[PDB]
Amino acid sequence: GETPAKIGDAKLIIGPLSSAWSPFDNKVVVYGHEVYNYDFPEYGTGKAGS
Amino acid sequence: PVKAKCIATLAPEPLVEHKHRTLILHLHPDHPTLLTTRSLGSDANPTRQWIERPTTVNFTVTGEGLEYTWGNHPPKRVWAQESGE
Numbered sequence: 001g002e003t004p005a006k007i008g009d010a011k012l013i014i015g016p017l018s019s020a021w022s023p024f025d026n027k028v029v030v031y032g033h034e035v036y037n038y039d040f041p042e043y044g045t046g047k048a049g050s
Numbered sequence: 051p052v053k054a055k056c057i058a059t060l061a062p063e064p065l066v067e068h069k070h071r072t073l074i075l076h077l078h079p080d081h082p083t084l085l086t087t088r089s090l091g092s093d094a095n096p097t098r099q100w101i102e103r104p105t106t107v108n109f110t111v112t113g114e115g116l117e118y119t120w121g122n123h124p125p126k127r128v129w130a131q132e133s134g135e
Contacts, residue, residue, distance in 0.1 A: 047065065047076065048065065049065070049076065049078040049104065050076070
C-alpha cells in the first residue's frame with residue numbers, strides 16, 4: 001500500500017489486502033503444472049520408496 | 051513333472067522401523083506378496099495378507115519374539131523386549 005503505477009495517466013495505490021490466505025502452504029511440491037501443497041520430508045532424508 | 055528348482059521369485063526388502071514392542075513396516079512390493087507372521091507365544095496370533103499395494107503395516111510384537119516372512123524371502127525374527135524405559 002504505497003506502490004503507484006503511473007501507466008496511462010492515473011496514479012493508483014493498492015492494498016495491502018486483508019485476506020492473507022496464501023493458498024500455498026509452507027511446504028510445497030511442484031510438478032510440471034500440478035502443484036501440491038505437500039509436506040515433502042526434506043532434502044537429505046527422504047525414505048526410500050517414499 | 052519333475053522337482054526342478056525354478057529360477058524363482060523374490061520381493062523387495064522391507065523397511066524395518068522400530069517402535070515400542072511394535073514393528074511399523076513401510077512396505078512396497080513388486081507383485082502381490084503373501085506376508086505372514088507367528089507370534090511365538092503359545093498364543094500364536096498369526097496374520098496373513100497378500101500385499102500388492104504398498105502399505106505401512108503394524109505388528110504388536112510380544113516380549114519373547116515374532117517372525118516375519120516377506121514373501122519367499124527367508125523368514126526374519128525379532129527381539130522386542132521393552133523400549134518404554
